Amino acid sequence: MTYSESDIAIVGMNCRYPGVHSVAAFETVLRTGCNILDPKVTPSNGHNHITLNNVYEHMAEFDANFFGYSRAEAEIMDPQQRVFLTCAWEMFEQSGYNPKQHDARVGLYAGVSTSFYLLTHLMNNPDKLAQLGGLQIMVGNDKDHLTSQLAYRLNITGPCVTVQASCATSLVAVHLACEGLLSGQCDMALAGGVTFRMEEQRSYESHGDGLQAEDGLIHTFDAQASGTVYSSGLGMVLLKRATDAQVQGDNILAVIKGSAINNDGGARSGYTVPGVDGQEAVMIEAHSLAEVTPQQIQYLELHGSGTPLGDAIEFAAIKRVFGTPAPNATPWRLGAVKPNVGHVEMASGITSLIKTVLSLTNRVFYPTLNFQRANPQLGLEDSPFEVVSRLTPWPEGTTPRTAGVSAFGLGGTNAHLVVQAPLSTPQARAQQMGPCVVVLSAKNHNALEQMQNALLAKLAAHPEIRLQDVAYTLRHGRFSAPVRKCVIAENCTQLARQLRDAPMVEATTGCTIYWRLGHRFVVALETLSDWLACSEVLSQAVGQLLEHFPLEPACLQDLSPAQRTFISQYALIALIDERETLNVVLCGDGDGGYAAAVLRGDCTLEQAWHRLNAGQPFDCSLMLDDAASDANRTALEALGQLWLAGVSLDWRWVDAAERMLGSQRIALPGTVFTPQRYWVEAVR
Amino acid sequence: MTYSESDIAIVGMNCRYPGVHSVAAFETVLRTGCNILDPKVTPSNGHNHITLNNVYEHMAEFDANFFGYSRAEAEIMDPQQRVFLTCAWEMFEQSGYNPKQHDARVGLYAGVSTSFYLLTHLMNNPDKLAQLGGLQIMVGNDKDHLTSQLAYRLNITGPCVTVQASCATSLVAVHLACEGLLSGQCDMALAGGVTFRMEEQRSYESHGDGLQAEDGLIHTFDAQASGTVYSSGLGMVLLKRATDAQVQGDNILAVIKGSAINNDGGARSGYTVPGVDGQEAVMIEAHSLAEVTPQQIQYLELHGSGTPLGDAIEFAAIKRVFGTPAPNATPWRLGAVKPNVGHVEMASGITSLIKTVLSLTNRVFYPTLNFQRANPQLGLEDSPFEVVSRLTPWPEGTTPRTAGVSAFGLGGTNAHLVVQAPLSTPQARAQQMGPCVVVLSAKNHNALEQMQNALLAKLAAHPEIRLQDVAYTLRHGRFSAPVRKCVIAENCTQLARQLRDAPMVEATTGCTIYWRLGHRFVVALETLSDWLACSEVLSQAVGQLLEHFPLEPACLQDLSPAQRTFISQYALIALIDERETLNVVLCGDGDGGYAAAVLRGDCTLEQAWHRLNAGQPFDCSLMLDDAASDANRTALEALGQLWLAGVSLDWRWVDAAERMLGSQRIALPGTVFTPQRYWVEAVR
C-alpha cells in the first residue's frame, strides 16, 4: 500500500520552550512528565501572585552576523522573529534540506504574538526608538515580516503568509500549508508559530476569573482546574506531499490525513467563550476529510486550556463527535500538553501536534500532568474516554495508529487535525558498500573543525548510520559555505581518518579548470543516463546522434566503450559548462581527443562523432580515465576537486556517479552558529 | 458560454478613505481624478515637512450598542477592527446577504496594520491601560482578532483567518479566499484589509531617502517620483464561485480568473528591496492559472508605489512578463491608485482591485495622477505600454475586458490577480407583476421609520428597480429585527402608501398561533413542490402517500383539488412546526378538517389520507382558503402575519408562494446605525 493523494507527510519539526532547546529535549519533558513552568504562588490582597519559568531565557541570543544583520538591525529585530529564523534554518538542516537553496517551491505559513519586545523594551529606549528609523522598527516587529524575513534569509519564493488566529494560529498555519501543498502552490512548506513573553510578563496576578490558574497549574480536565497559564514557546513543522516524501528519501515522521479550520461563529455566550457547536463542527469536518470514523482514532490531543468552562465545553464537543465505541473496544485516550509547557499563545497548536507526532513515532501516550481527579462536570468516568496520566504504550489495532489534534483559539477560531502513523517502511535494504562523496563546508576553518568533530562524534555514537545517507544528506541538506572539505569514503569508520587528514580548502574564485580526457572513461549506464537526463539540451543533442529521443538505458548500452568514453566525457563537462561557463581548458588522449576537440569548439559534436566512427584523431587539473581508477570513481574525485576549487555543482551529478540506491535524508549535526546577545533594555 | 469552474465572482465591495465613505464615492474620486491627501509642504531644516489628509476622521465612531459591545470594550477596541466590522455588515447588506445569518459557509480572510491606537493612545492612558484588563486590551488590538470578531458578530463559522503580508495583505487575503472557495472550505467569502493612521502620524519629515515623497505626491512612474506617501484606508470584497453566483441572483461585478502569491526570496539587494525575478514570477504564475496570455490582458493596475527604484523594478518585471504585442495592437494600459488615495499599508491591494473592478464595470480606464512625464529609466516611450493619465473609455476587443492587479509588499511578499469583466448578462427578463412580500425590521420604531423613508427615497430615485428584487433582497439580505413591518404589494409605487399605512409590530414571543383550514387551499404546483422540497421529512412522508420518491412536479399535478388542499395545508404548517414547535391550535372546514386532525395529531397522515379518499370527515389567527383570496396570496398574507407575530420563517417558504422568477439581490438602504464616539485620549 502507498500514501493517499491527499496525505501530507511531516518530514520535519522544531520547537523551543524555556529550558527546552530541541525537539529531542521536549520529548524528554513529555516522557519524564515534567512541568517546565515550576510556578510560585504568593497570596496577594485576596488574590494570588504567580511567578513562572515562562520566559525563553535565550531569546536575546542570535547569529546576526551569520544571517547578515547589522548589530543595530538585530537589536531592534523582535526576538520571536530571530529565534524563529534560527530554528527554521536548523529544522531545514535537520530534515536534510539546504536552508538557502530549494529545488522545489517552498511555502511559509506561520504566526507570531505581538512584539512585547517592541511594546516594553524598544518603546522605552527613546534613543534607539528613533536613532535606527521607525520603518526598520516596524520591519523588526510587525507580525507581517515574520514570514517575509524567513523568505528572504532562506531564499524561499513559495507562498509566504503570516497567518494569525489566536491560539489556533500554529494549526491554522499547518492547515493552510497542507492546503498550499495539495493545491500545488508549493511543494514543501514550513508551518508554525512563536510566542515570547518578556521578563516583565513573567509574573501574573490571579483574579479568580477562572481564566488564569490560581495555583500556576494547568489542571486540564481536573477538578481543580482554575484556569490556564501562559508561557513562552515556539513550534514549527516541515510538510510535504506524502506521495513525494515517500520517494524523495524523507523520514516521514507522521501523516496529516485531513485538517479543518472554522469559527464558533455566533454560537457562544460571548466573544471569549468556546462554542460547542463550532468545535463539534471542525472536528467532524476534519474527520470527514481524513476519511476516518471516530472509532478509527485512538488518541485525542486536547486543547486542554485548564479553564473549567473551556475544558467542560471541549469535552462536550468531543462526546458529541465520538459517541459510543464498538462493544469492548478500548476507551478513547485523551491527552494535553499545556500542563507540561504552559499555554503558548501562538505555538500551542503546533506544540500539541509535535507532542502527538512524538506520541506516534515513540508509540506511547505521554502523561498529562496535574490530573489527579476528573472534573465532575465532564462525567468522564461513565464516558468511553480516559485522560492519560501515565506513560503508557500505544497498543496496535487492526487500523493504523491515529490521533486527532485540536486547537481552539480565543475568539472562536478553531482548527483540527487527523494525524496518523506513517506506512511501515519495508526495508530489505541491502546496504551497498561503495564510494561515497562526503562534503563539509563552513564560513571559517574554526567552524569546519567543530562541524567535523561533531559529525564524527555522531557517527561514532550511532555506528548504525549508513554512509549513503550521510553523504547524501551532507550534499542536499547543507549549504556550500566558502571553506570546504571533501572526502570519498567506503564507510563511516574509514571516514574519520580521511576527514582528519584531508585539507580544508577556501574557494579561490575563477581559477583555470584544466581537463585531461584520457583514452577510456566508460562510466556506468545508470550514471550516463542520469547525467544526460539532467539536461534537455544534452538529451536532444545525444538523442540525435543515437537517432533515439527520448534516450533509454538500453540505447546507451549499444555504444562501444570507445564511444561511451567520448559521450560520457563530453556530457559531464557540458553539464558543468551549461550550469556555469567557467574557464575550462582541455587536452585529449586517443579516444579523448575527439571529445576534447568538440568541447573546445573546434567542431560540432556529430562532426567529431562521425570522425570517431571514422577513426580520425586530433593532436585546477582534472583527468577522466579508467587507467587511473574506476571511471565512475575518477568522476567522483573529479567533481569533488571541482567543488573544493569552489565550482557550483548540481549534486545530482554526484548522486548519479555514486549510484547509491535508496539513500536517505538523515538528521546530522549542521551549521554551527556562534550567536551574540542582541538586546535593548528599557530605560526606567 | 458559462463561467469556468475555477472562476471566482466578486459580488460585493466596500471601502473607506479619509473623506471617502462609500464605494460610490471612491468611484467619484477615481472618475474626477482627485487626490484626497491634499498635501502641504513646508521647507524645514533643509528638508520638507509634509502634512496630509491621511487620517480617517470617523475612526472613533461606532455602534458599540448595536454590535453588543460595552462602552469600555468599544473604547479599547481598535478603530480598525470596529470600522472594519461596521463596513462588513454594511457590505453584506448591500450585497443582499443577511449579515448575521448564512445559508452557506462563509469565510473571513482579512488583515490589519498594527494598532497605533494601542501604541499611541491606549498605552498612554496608564489607567484604562490596566483598569480594563490586559487580556481585553489584547483582544481589542491584536491583529488575530480582526477576523475572529467579525466571525462572532456576523455569526460566521467558515474559515476565519487574519492574513498578514505587508502591502500585499489585502490581495493575499483575496487569494486565500478564492482558495478557500475553490477548495470548498467555504461557499462565500469576505476578503479585505484595513490600515488606520493615528493623528500623531498625520505629518511626516522628508529625509530624501527616496522612500517617502518630498512633495507629498506619489508620482507613479513619473520622472519626479521621489517616494510614496502613506495614508489611512480600508477595503473589502465579497467573493463566491462564479458558477454559483450566476444562478444565485448575485450581481457579478467582475471575475477573478486566477491568482498567485509568492516572495522575492533571496533575489534582491536587501530585505526591503523589490525583486524583479519574484514579481515576474508571480505575474507569470497568475496569468498561467487564469489561463491568459499577456496579449489577452489590456490593463494593469500597478503597485505604483512612487519610489523611483520600486517603480523601475516593477516595470522591468512587467516588460519581462508581457514582451511584445501582436503587430499594430493597441499598447498595454498601465494605471495606479496610490496617487489618488495614498499608499494604504494593508488595504492597498484591495483598493487597487476595487479601482480595477470599477474600471471594468464602468468600462473606463481612470486617470493615474501626478504623471506628467515618464521616468527615463522606465523607457516607457519605446515600450508597448502606456500610463493612463486621462479618463478614457475601455475599448472592446475580440476577447473579454481583462486586467491584472499587482500588490508587492515590503519584505518581498507579492500577489497578482487576473480580473475579467463578467459574462454579459442575457437578460430576457419578462419582469412579472404580481404580489410581493416586502418586509422591514429594526431594533426600535424610530429606526424602522428612518429605514422606511430611506427605502422609499431610494425606490423613488430609481423607478427602474423591480419589486421582485426589492422584496427578495429585504428578506434574504436583512436581519429580522424585533420591530417589524410587512406588506404585500404589486409595485414599488403602490408600496409607499402601504408601508406608511401599515403598522409596526413588536414581536411578542410565544403567543398562540391559531390555524383555520378552509375547504379549499390549492396552491400552485411550483409552490407545493418547493415547499415539500424544503424538508426530507416531508418529501418522504408524501413520497410514501404518492408511492413515488423522489417527488416530481407531475406527480403532484395528478392530485385532486380536494387532496392538494389537504396536502398543501399540511405541508406548510408541518414546515413551520418542524422549524419551530410553537403553540399551534387548529380548526378545519370540510377538506380542511382532514389536515387539521393530522396536524393536531388525532391520527397519522396516511390515516387521514385514506379517510379523505374514503370521504370520512372530522367534527394570532390565520386561515388557509381559496374562498378568501387566491390560495397562494392567502399563504403570503398568512406567512407575513406569522413573521409579524414574530415567528421565525424560512424565507424560501415565502419565495415559493410568491413564485417570483429571476429575482435578484440589489443594493438598497439597510441597517441604520446611530454610532457614538468611543475614544481613549493620550494623557500627556
B370, amino acid identity: N
- Whether the Cβ atoms of residue A52 and residue A39 lie closer than 8 Å to each other: yes
Which residues partner with A108 through β-bridges?
A: A160, A190
Q: Which of A143, A155, A163 is the closest to B161 by Cβ?
A: A163
Beta strands in B341-447 (DSSP E): 364-365, 385-387, 392-393, 402-408, 413-420, 436-442
- Whether the Cβ atoms of residue A672 and residue A442 lie closer than 8 Å to each other: yes
In a 10 Å sphere around its CB, with 0-12 CB exposed, 13-18 middle and 19+ buried, how is residue A591 labelled? buried
Q: What residues of chain B lie within 8 A of the CB of A160, using their CB?
A: 165, 261-263, 412-413
**Which DSSP category does A380 fall into?**
T
Residue A586 host element (H or E): strand A584-588
Contact yes or no for B148 and A267 at CB 8 A = no
Q: Give the residue from A214, A196, A159, A210 showing the smallest Cα distance to A39.
A: A214
Rounded Cα gap, residues B160 and A165, in angstroms: 8
Rounded Cα gap, residues A235 and A431, in angstroms: 35
- Does residue A33 come out as left (phi exceeding 0), alpha (psi in the -120 to 50 range) or beta? left
Q: Give the residue from B620, B591, B621, B594 showing the smallest Cα distance to B606.
A: B594
Which of A137, A271, A288 would you mutate first to test chain B, the one with the most B CBs within 10 A?
Answer: A271
Q: Which of A147, A165, A262 is the closest to B158 by Cβ?
A: A262
- Whether the Cβ atoms of residue B249 and residue B662 lie closer than 8 Å to each other: yes
Rounded Cα gap, residues A415 and B69, in angstroms: 26
For B534, the 3-state DSSP assignment is coil
- Whether the Cβ atoms of residue A363 and residue A392 lie closer than 8 Å to each other: no
Q: What is the largest CA-CA distance in chain A?
A: 102
DSSP B430-480: ------EEEEEEESSHHHHHHHHHHHHHHHHH-TT--HHHHHHHHHHTS--
Q: Between β-strands B299-301 and B332-335, what pairing exists: parallel, antiparallel or unpaired?
A: parallel
Q: Which residue of B has its CA nearest to A206?
A: B133
Q: Between β-strands A47-51 and A40-44, what pairing exists: parallel, antiparallel or unpaired?
A: antiparallel
- Whether the Cβ atoms of residue B310 and residue B276 lie closer than 8 Å to each other: no
Q: Which residue of B has its CA nearest to A289?
A: B185
For A136, the 3-state DSSP assignment is helix
For residue B621, report the phi and psi dihedrals to the nearest 5 degrees.
Answer: -95, 130
Rounded Cα gap, residues B254 and B357, in angstroms: 6
How distant is the Cα of B536 from the closest Cα of chain A, in angstroms? 22
Q: What residues of chain B lie within 8 A of the CB of A114, using their CB?
A: 138, 141-143
Helices (H), A384-516: 445-461, 467-476, 492-501
Contact yes or no for A157 and B114 at CB 8 A = no
Q: Between β-strands B402-408 and B299-301, what pairing exists: parallel, antiparallel or unpaired?
A: parallel
Contact yes or no for B263 and A143 at CB 8 A = no
Q: Give the residue from B98, B55, B43 showing the smallest Cα distance to B80.
A: B55
Q: Residue B406 to residues B214, B344, B414: CA-CA distances in angstroms? A: 25, 14, 8
Rounded Cα gap, residues A345 and A342, in angstroms: 9
Q: Between β-strands B188-195 and B106-112, what pairing exists: parallel, antiparallel or unpaired?
A: parallel
- Whether the Cβ atoms of residue B235 and residue B10 lie closer than 8 Å to each other: no
Beta strands in B61-179 (DSSP E): 61-62, 106-112, 160-164
Measured over the CA atoms of residue A97, residue A99, residue A101 and residue A105, the dihedral's sign is positive
For A617, the 3-state DSSP assignment is coil
Rounded Cα gap, residues A402 and A256, in angstroms: 10
Q: Which three cell numbers stand for residue A336?
A: 494535553
DSSP B116-137: HIIIIIGGG-HHHHHHT-HHHH
Helices (H), B342-392: 348-361
How distant is the Cα of B539 from the closest Cα of chain A, in angstroms? 27
Q: Which three cell numbers stand for residue B480?
A: 429580522
Cis peptide before B617 (omega within 30 of 0): no
Rounded Cα gap, residues B234 and B194, in angstroms: 4
In a 10 Å sphere around its CB, with 0-12 CB exposed, 13-18 middle and 19+ buried, how is residue A620 labelled? middle
Contact yes or no for A261 and B143 at CB 8 A = no
How distant is the Cα of B69 from the closest Cα of chain A, in angstroms? 10
Q: Between β-strands B40-44 and B8-16, what pairing exists: parallel, antiparallel or unpaired?
A: unpaired
Contact yes or no for A165 and B161 at CB 8 A = yes
User: What's the length of chain A?
Assistant: 684
Rounded Cα gap, residues B335 and B327, in angstroms: 23
- Whether the Cβ atoms of residue A195 and residue A113 lie closer than 8 Å to each other: yes
For B236, the 3-state DSSP assignment is strand
Q: What is the largest CA-CA distance in chain B?
A: 103
A84, amino acid identity: F
| Experimental technique | X-ray
Rounded Cα gap, residues A217 and A222, in angstroms: 11
Which residue shows C-alpha cell 479619509? B18
Q: Which of A138, A262, A266 is the closest to B159 by Cβ?
A: A262
* CA A146 to chain CA mean position, Å: 17
B586, amino acid identity: L
For B274, the 3-state DSSP assignment is coil
Q: Cβ of A104: how many Cβ atoms within 10 Å?
A: 12
- Whether the Cβ atoms of residue A185 and residue A158 lie closer than 8 Å to each other: yes
In a 10 Å sphere around its CB, with 0-12 CB exposed, 13-18 middle and 19+ buried, how is residue A298 labelled? buried
Contact yes or no for A160 and B281 at CB 8 A = no
Beta strands in A4-62 (DSSP E): 8-16, 40-44, 47-51, 61-62
Q: Which three cell numbers stand for residue A509?
A: 574564485
Q: Which three cell numbers stand for residue A357?
A: 507526532
Which residue shows C-alpha cell 508587492? B408
Rounded Cα gap, residues A139 and A156, in angstroms: 18
Q: Which of B154, B157, B411 is the closest to A278 by Cβ?
A: B157
Q: Which of A144, A179, A183 is the closest to B166 by Cβ?
A: A144
Cis peptide before A126 (omega within 30 of 0): no
Which of A121, A144, A183, A271 would you mutate first to test chain B, the one with the most B CBs within 10 A?
Answer: A144
Rounded Cα gap, residues A459 and A494, in angstroms: 11
Q: Cβ of A54: how many Cβ atoms within 10 Å?
A: 27
Q: Which long-range contacts (CB under 8 A, 24 or more apart) does A392-396 make?
A: A392/A364, A392/A365, A393/A363, A393/A364, A393/A365, A394/A298, A394/A299, A394/A359, A394/A360, A394/A363, A394/A364, A394/A365, A395/A298, A395/A330
Q: Give the residue from A259, A398, A228 showing the smallest Cα distance to A330.
A: A398
- Does residue A387 come out as left (phi exceeding 0), alpha (psi in the -120 to 50 range) or beta? beta
Rounded Cα gap, residues B178 and B176, in angstroms: 6
Rounded Cα gap, residues B387 and B381, in angstroms: 10
Residue A88 host element (H or E): helix A79-94
Q: After which residues is chain B broken (C to N over 2.5 A)?
A: 619
Q: What is the CA radius of gyration of chain B?
A: 29
Which residues partner with B55 through β-bridges?
A: none
- Whether the Cβ atoms of residue B626 and residue B521 lie closer than 8 Å to each other: yes
For residue A591, report the phi and psi dihedrals to the nearest 5 degrees.
Answer: -50, -25
Q: Give the residue from B380, B293, B371, B367 showing the smallest Cα distance to B337.
A: B367
CA torsion B283→B287→B288→B292, rounded to 10°?
-160
Residue B12 host element (H or E): strand B8-16
* CA B153 to chain CA mean position, Å: 15
Q: Which three cell numbers stand for residue B191?
A: 476578503
Rounded Cα gap, residues A232 and A202, in angstroms: 9
For A611, the 3-state DSSP assignment is helix
Rounded Cα gap, residues A634 and A521, in angstroms: 9
Q: What residues of chain A lie within 8 A of the CB of B176, using their CB?
A: 161, 176
Q: In what order do the strands lie in the sheet with A505-506?
A: A436-442, A483-489, A505-506
- Whether the Cβ atoms of residue B342 and residue B52 lie closer than 8 Å to each other: yes
For A33, the 3-state DSSP assignment is coil
Q: Cβ of B589: how many Cβ atoms within 10 Å?
A: 17
Q: Cβ of B445: how many Cβ atoms within 10 Å?
A: 12
B30, amino acid identity: L
Q: What residues of chain B lie within 8 A of the CB of A113, using their CB?
A: 142
Q: After which residues is chain A broken (C to N over 2.5 A)?
A: 619
- Whether the Cβ atoms of residue B580 and residue B510 lie closer than 8 Å to each other: no
Q: What residues of chain B lie within 8 A of the CB of A154, using their CB?
A: 266
**Which class does domain A8-420 fall in?**
alpha beta
**Which DSSP category does A272 fall into?**
T
Contact yes or no for B265 and A155 at CB 8 A = yes
Q: Which of A114, A154, A281 is the closest to B157 by Cβ?
A: A281
Contact yes or no for B153 and A266 at CB 8 A = yes
Contact yes or no for A183 and B183 at CB 8 A = yes
Rounded Cα gap, residues A595 and A569, in angstroms: 7
Spatial neighbors of B233 by CB under 8 A, at least 6 apart, are B15, B16, B17, B56, B194, B195, B341, B342, B344, B347, B348, B351
Q: Give the residue from B355, B362, B354, B353 showing the smallest Cα distance to B401.
A: B362
Q: Give the residue from A514, A551, A513, A512 showing the smallest Cα distance to A531.
A: A551
Q: Which three cell numbers stand for residue A308?
A: 473549567
Q: Which three cell numbers stand for residue B342?
A: 495614498
SS (H, E, C) B639-670: HHHHHHHCCCCCHHHHHHHHCCCCCCCCCCCC
- Whether the Cβ atoms of residue A252 and residue A13 lie closer than 8 Å to each other: no
For A513, the 3-state DSSP assignment is strand
For A396, the 3-state DSSP assignment is coil
Contact yes or no for B151 and A412 at CB 8 A = yes
How distant is the Cα of A267 from the closest Cα of chain B, in angstroms? 7
Which of A103, A148, A171, A479 would you mutate first to test chain B, the one with the most B CBs within 10 A?
Answer: A148
Rounded Cα gap, residues A157 and A186, in angstroms: 9
Q: Which residue of A has its CA nearest to B274?
A: A152
Which of A263, A284, A345, A414 would you mutate first to test chain B, the one with the most B CBs within 10 A?
Answer: A263
Q: Which three cell numbers stand for residue B74?
A: 468599544
Measured over the CA atoms of residue B608, residue B614, residue B618 and residue B623, the dihedral's sign is positive
- Whether the Cβ atoms of residue B338 and residue B220 lie closer than 8 Å to each other: yes
Measured over the CA atoms of residue A82, residue A88, residue A91 and residue A92, the dihedral's sign is negative
Q: Between β-strands B385-387 and B332-335, what pairing exists: parallel, antiparallel or unpaired?
A: parallel
Which residue shows C-alpha cell 420591530? B483
Spatial neighbors of B425 by CB under 8 A, at least 6 apart, are none
